[model samples]
Target: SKVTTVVATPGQGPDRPQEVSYTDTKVIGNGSFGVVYQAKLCDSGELVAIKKVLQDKRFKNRELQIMRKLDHCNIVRLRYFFYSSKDEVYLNLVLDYVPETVYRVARHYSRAKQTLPVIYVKLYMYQLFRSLAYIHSFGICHRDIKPQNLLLDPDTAVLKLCDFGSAKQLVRGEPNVSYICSRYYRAPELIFGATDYTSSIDVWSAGCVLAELLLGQPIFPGDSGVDQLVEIIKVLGTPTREQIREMNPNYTEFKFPQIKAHPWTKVFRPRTPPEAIALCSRLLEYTPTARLTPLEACAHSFFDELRDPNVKLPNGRDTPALFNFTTQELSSNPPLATILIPPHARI
Candidate 1:
């Protein structure tokens, strides 16, 4: 009897606003900015997360706006969004409810003193790169690219990225900057507060994720200010003077003694695949432009197994539509087109 209804506009597709009904609402998450609700759609009996936010300062938020433009199998779908007004107005977003995030799943493995199966690790990162390739095709830099935003389907072994974190990414006219070290998966250039940074920010964060999945925990030793950078330098080693200049002048002013770079092989456990380590090396370069683009990462050799015809998800299931590269997607790179799509998977 607790069903609630409202007229809402579809996040994608048409302009026609329609009535939406949902029940069993409870808090999934909350912050100073907004509250998220886990609710059930009455008609379909499907669960959805409704992100409700205070709207006086924001009749709009970038995450809601960007979510509408993004449509992909590997990204969370926004079914609808509506507004409510009492004394203060509120904006609610109805999003597809996935089972859990990569962060939680990683924690589950970490607590058990186990790591994700190598096949599973490859599967997840391939999906993540595809999602990144899709999102970056628009030339948008996803400032937020932590494990928390990577939603996973436990049964199907699927991954879908959500929450671009565009809503509070900037503070009072400071463009393209978020709170430093707010999380473990930030780029070194980001840590240096390089406002001029480009798409490489996402690549670096993705590299952090790849390393974390392989390590069964975070790569950065600490989340605090400069200590986080030490975690980066301790493994990847120091950024040079020109590299410092490429990122920002903040570090150049304080240039210190020689710090030798460590071998990538030594960075991970001895048993870790060399192919995965090579990919991480390419994605996590000290200079922003030195890094591989998301499309390049998608075509990395580490994911070659995914292109195999014999590859199948857990017994009863088939693989997700991984080879369905849209014309828009394939338009980015010509050389890798043949390598990305396999003969059997061809249309």
Candidate 2:
């Protein structure tokens, strides 16, 4: 084999210089924009994540501009950084590694436990809501909101919301916001063609997240676009022509013909918490304006008991602390194998 190289842990002192600032031997994750390496702080020997963004004069500049403007708990923290002679920009992201194992732990849990001890789910939702609320308050709407974009630090069980490349800021009451969330997490307005959207889109996606957490599975795991739309209408009921027209004038062009109303939803739902039921119903409401605002969401009955259990102070035992991850499970296998859990284990 070609010569293998090694680097000293963070503080062997700058005296023992390493070949690379962060060794590839400890690669945690990689993406189109950059590669993430678990690096040791040269001075304190503290372990931190370092992202190397490859410049192509194509998308690197765009990503850096956005990354520089972010700072929030739910969002990841960035620390020291540098650039390479080859024009590669290195982002020394300060973050604690979240093990993929905590996520996988639920794989063997009963659906009831998988959803987290009920108490945990409530806490998780509160944090999620708060994070999204902060993003919306800044007039920034994350076009993509999903589980993968959410990072959880098991030590304190705090959830961090990262990834804003597709995020856009709205001028409030502006008629232009990008409808660019993941297919499954997308709201009904986007599906039915709504361009001038608002923060309600995030609320809808939050609803999906809540339902997924509670049920330990996707509320509407549609296989295709048509299937997705059909699932929404089935659960929430179709909108009336007047309602549709009032909501979106462009609604008429779409073929949402009035069908013989059926009791489609009655057969699908299982008995769930009333608070949860009401919240999900409001989020999936045909009118986005009718959806709950973040303040209102904070006051919702569902969260009445989530605090304290879900949120602790900055230094509490259950509070979120900095994470340190050294390795990640890597395989070219399909995601389904790792993600799919049977119904029995879901509860």
**Once superposed on the true structure, which residue ranges of model 2 sit more than 4 Å away at CA?**
1-25, 31-34, 56-63, 85-96, 100-114, 172-179, 242-248, 257-271, 308-347
**lDDT for position 307 in model 2:** 32
**lDDT of the structure predicted as candidate 2:** 0.57
Query: How does candidate 2 fare on TM-score?
Result: 0.70
Please write out the lDDT profile of model 2 over residues 168-212, one tens digit for every residue. Answer: 776656675434677777877777667777767888887777666
Per-candidate TM equals 0.93, 0.70
Global fold similarity of model 1 (TM-score): 0.93
What are the per-model numbers of colliding residue pairs?
0, 7
Candidate 1 per-residue lDDT over residues 1-347, each given as its tens digit: 79899999999989889999999989987863267899999999999998887666635677777788888889999899998964787778888889788989999999999988888888889888888878777765667788888899887888998776552233323556645424577788877877766667888889999999998888886758778888888877788888877876555575576588888898898899999999999988888888988778889999998889888775557777788877667667856778888898765
